[PDB]
Amino acid sequence: MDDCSGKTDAWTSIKGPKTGGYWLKQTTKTGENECTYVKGTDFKENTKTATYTYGYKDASGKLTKTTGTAMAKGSDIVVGSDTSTVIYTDGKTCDVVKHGGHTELWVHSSKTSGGYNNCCDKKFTETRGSTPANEVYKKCPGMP
């Protein structure tokens, strides 16, 4: 089955499986920071808010770690002045989001080797249109 439509809940995407974290696998953005990631903690179901720790590979190959508060607002994930809009999430293995004109495919740390929900592949292709995808997960340290 291809249960790929209407799976646009931001809170489901913020939480994921509430363990591990997510790596940015592919993006339409060129010059993206390698090993971009998000890990969620401090999950509050009743306010659909969590802490994000997020970052990417620094000059020494180590990850930056910036914290912020992620709020679910319908299909939008809001971190202060930035927003990502969920196109597809399974809350388990992967997400497709629209982030500042760019299309992003995020994959949970358990599925880095493959086998995440193929709705993500479909919806990523649909969303990005003619803009090529770029690989982001290259020579990465561990998830914080």
From Swiss-Prot:
Pfam families with a match to the protein in the record: His_binding (PF02098)
Domain of life of the native organism: Eukaryota
Subcellular location: Secreted
Protein name per the record: Allergen Arg r 1
UniProtKB keywords: Allergen, Disulfide bond, Secreted, Signal
GO biological process: symbiont-mediated perturbation of host defenses
Disulphide bond pairs: 35-140, 94-119
PTM note: Not glycosylated.
One Gene Ontology cellular component annotation held by this UniProt entry: extracellular region
SUPFAM superfamilies: Lipocalins
Species, as recorded: Argas reflexus
A GO molecular-function annotation: amine binding
Main location: secreted
Gene3D superfamilies the record matches: 2.40.128.20
Keyword check for Glycosyltransferase: no
Family: Belongs to the calycin superfamily. Histamine-binding salivary protein family.
